[PDB]
Amino acid sequence: MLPHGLIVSCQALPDEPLHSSFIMSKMALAAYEGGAVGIRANTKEDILAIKETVDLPVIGIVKRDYDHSDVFITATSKEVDELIESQCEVIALDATLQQRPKETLDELVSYIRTHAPNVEIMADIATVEEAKNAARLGFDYIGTTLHGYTSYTQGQLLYQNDFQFLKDVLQSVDAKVIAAGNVITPDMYKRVMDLGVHCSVVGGAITRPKEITKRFVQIMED
Amino acid sequence: MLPHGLIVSCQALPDEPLHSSFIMSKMALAAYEGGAVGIRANTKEDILAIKETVDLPVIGIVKRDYDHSDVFITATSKEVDELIESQCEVIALDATLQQRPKETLDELVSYIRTHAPNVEIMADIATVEEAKNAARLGFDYIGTTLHGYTSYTQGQLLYQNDFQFLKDVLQSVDAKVIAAGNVITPDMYKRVMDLGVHCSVVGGAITRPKEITKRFVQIMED
Ligand SMILES: [Cl-]
Ligand SMILES: [Cl-]
């Protein structure tokens, strides 16, 4: 099971500067040496590289776009099969009620429990309605990952109104909640942990130097 | 000449997770895409990789330890010759009063002006008196890099007492001053720029995921 604490997301999609299974493995090493309790990573190849540098538990996804669907985080059983091959400890997937390319969400959850019975699952949700559905489905972890990153949550960011969205998720489910998406400072990490999340995912504020650089430059441009 | 704005330091010494000319070149590309106006980098191999990736001006150093000297930033003519070969726009060196392994500081400044007449020089100092000495020696830039990192500045850190050390350096010299060392947050960057530095170096807060991770974990351990 994931410990309480900091999960570092070590992702770099094609055309991002640090795109490389190799490079993400050394980023995960840095996160381990700095006190992370877990890693979140994208694609079987990055997961397998990370598993050669660190023994931290990994939350795996596969970001892959499909025609005629906006679902791109572990959309179908093809992505699930890649993640079962990766041997990541937690399989995360979009758990929105958006139209998927192939299996429905219920079917994908059933598929994972059948084919990978020793692997925990994490729901990436955008609304309280989705979070409560994920708890019904027996997800091990419910994350706020897609809040602000769907067409129906545009402009909403996790930290808005003193993390009201997170407070609403925590009140709505008894499952382990993960604060993920727009946790960008140590002060925000402390806030979400104080509100009672199991653990938090921090990505860009540690592993996207372009994103961090933009925050430094922007302070001079306000 | 260096512009005003943000210089991102892209360093990873041999024991660090990201040690790699290729990775530091991608850190530098990320910094460029985020709005940096220059790069600081360590070793000829890293600098050459960076300069083939981005056209930003580079402040070059060579960190190399020598017996019976506490000087390790561009300590001798060996390191200067490596930086001349690198074609970096600005050669930075320890500009402390500490005895060097080979050539004195004054010796190395004259050596750079005669062997690389088109290259600007940056003084990494620890004290106001070293800042004044570097102005005497005709440095183009004077940085606060070693303030708090010498045996005669122990316990001192740039940000202490609302950046009083920086205010004292700016009052003491007419040359372009660079805020470098312990510029940890966008708020610190804004403060030093508002106090009148030419530009500021930010390294580990952008390009050392281990140190950023450590800052997230620490907030929970206070
Ligand atoms: Cl990046
Ligand atoms: Cl690091």
Residue numbers in the entry:
A (entry chain AAA), B (entry chain BBB): 1 to 222
How does the study describe this entry?
As Glu180 forms a short hydrogen bond with the C5 hydroxyl of the substrate, we generated SaNanE-Glu180Ala and tested the effect of this substitution on activity. We found that SaNanE-Glu180Ala retained ∼0.05% activity, but the KM was similar to that of the wildtype enzyme, suggesting that Glu180 plays a role in the catalytic mechanism. The single-residue substitution made no change to the overall structure or the conserved active-site residues. The salt bridge between Arg40 and Asp124 was preserved to stabilize the enolate, and the KM was similar to wildtype SaNanE, indicating that the short bond to the C5 hydroxyl makes only a minor contribution to substrate binding. This suggests that the reduction in kcat is due to the loss of Glu180 in the reaction mechanism rather than a compromise in substrate binding. The residual activity of the enzyme may result from an active-site water molecule that acts in place of Glu180 during catalysis, a phenomenon we have seen before in another unrelated TIM-barrel enzyme, dihydrodipicolinate synthase.
